Amino acid sequence: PNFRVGKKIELRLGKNLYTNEYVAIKLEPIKSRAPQLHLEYRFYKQLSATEGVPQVYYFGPCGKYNAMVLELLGPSLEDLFDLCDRTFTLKTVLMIAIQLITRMEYVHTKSLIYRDVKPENFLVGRPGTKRQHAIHIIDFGLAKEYIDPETKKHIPYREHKSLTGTARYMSINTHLGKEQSRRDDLEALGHMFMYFLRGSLPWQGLKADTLKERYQKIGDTKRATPIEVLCENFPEEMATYLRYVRRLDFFEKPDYDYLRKLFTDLFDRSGFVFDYEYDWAGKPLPTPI
Numbered sequence: 001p002n003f004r005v006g007k008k009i010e011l012r013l014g015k016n017l018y019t020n021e022y023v024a025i026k027l028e029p030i031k032s033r034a035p036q037l038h039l040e041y042r043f044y045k046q047l048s049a050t051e052g053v054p055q056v057y058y059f060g061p062c063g064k065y066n067a068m069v070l071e072l073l074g075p076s077l078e079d080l081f082d083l084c085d086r087t088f089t090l091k092t093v094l095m096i097a098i099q100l101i102t103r104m105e106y107v108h109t110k111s112l113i114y115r116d117v118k119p120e121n122f123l124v125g126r127p128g129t130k131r132q133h134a135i136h137i138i139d140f141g142l143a144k145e146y147i148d149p150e151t152k153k154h155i156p157y158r159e160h161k162s163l164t165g166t167a168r169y170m171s172i173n174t175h176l177g178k179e180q181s182r183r184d185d186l187e188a189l190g191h192m193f194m195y196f197l198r199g200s201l202p203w204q205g206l207k208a209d210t211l212k213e214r215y216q217k218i219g220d221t222k223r224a225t226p227i228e229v230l231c232e233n234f235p236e237e238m239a240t241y242l243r244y245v246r247r248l249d250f251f252e253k254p255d256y257d258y259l260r261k262l263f264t265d266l267f268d269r270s271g272f273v274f275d276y277e278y279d280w281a282g283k284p285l286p287t288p289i
């Protein structure tokens with residue numbers, strides 16, 4: 001349709017001219033060597049049929065750029081994490097986790113692996129909207145098809161991959177240079193869940209002579225940190241989740257129902273109600289508007 005573009009939030013704020021609804025506009029130089037935005041558009045369209053991703057409204061030229069126009073959502077879990085003094089309660093982590101296992105299952109069901117799990121990439125809905133309490137997944141810049149579309153077969157196992165990604169959440173097998181698969185998306189979520197609960201991960205803050213060596217140093221520490229220690233003083237289901245996903249084979253389909261039951265059983269046993277009343281409920285949320 002017809003859109004106008006505003007200030008930076010390259011991501012910009014924009015407006016649908018006929019509805020006067022705000023939107024987000026991602027921009028890539030039209031003269032780019034290595035254009036990637038069209039590829040990310042492709043992924044969002046593959047995933048269109050769920051309400052856990054932003055809607056995309058347009059891909060094409062806005063001037064000296066190509067533009068992808070998408071639904072404007074709320075703050076990221078990292079934004080909200082900061083708001084809540086960098087810890088989340090169990091109830092809030094569980095509501096997040098149950099949603100994101102389902103979200104990740106849906107991405108996997110559409111033949112894609114995500115490969116960029118981090119709290120910055122999960123957003124609540126826009127304050128005041130119907131889906132304001134839902135958690136959404138964004139940014140498929142690192143995503144990849146794990147099922148070849150002609151052969152209908154899973155991508156081959158491969159080693160010595162070079163590391164791109166947020167070192168903090170990545171799976172141990174990713175650290176090792178292995179081709180990422182479904183398992184790795186779920187392990188990374190697990191690391192993020194512990195991050196939320198603990199306030200931090202014990203391999204945060206590590207520094208090295210290079211970024212390559214920082215990845216290695218962080219991987220060493222993940223390998224040297226037993227799940228029993230990492231999840232010490234937190235429910236066993238957290239460790240149960242982590243052990244399960246750490247043991248998954250490269251080609252293995254995860255039992256998403258099982259992992260979800262771990263958490264939904266604990267949620268109920270804990271006496272929690274799925275009210276979408278998060279730690280950040282009632283707090284004034286940031287907006288570009």
Ligand SMILES: Nc1ncnc2c1c(I)cn2[C@@H]1O[C@H](CO)[C@@H](O)[C@H]1O
Binds near residue numbers: 139
């Ligand atoms: N569609 C959207 N609606 C609202 N905000 C958005 C998006 C998208 I795509 C990204 N963001 C914000 O930009 C930060 C960097 O990805 C993210 O951490 C996030 O806060």
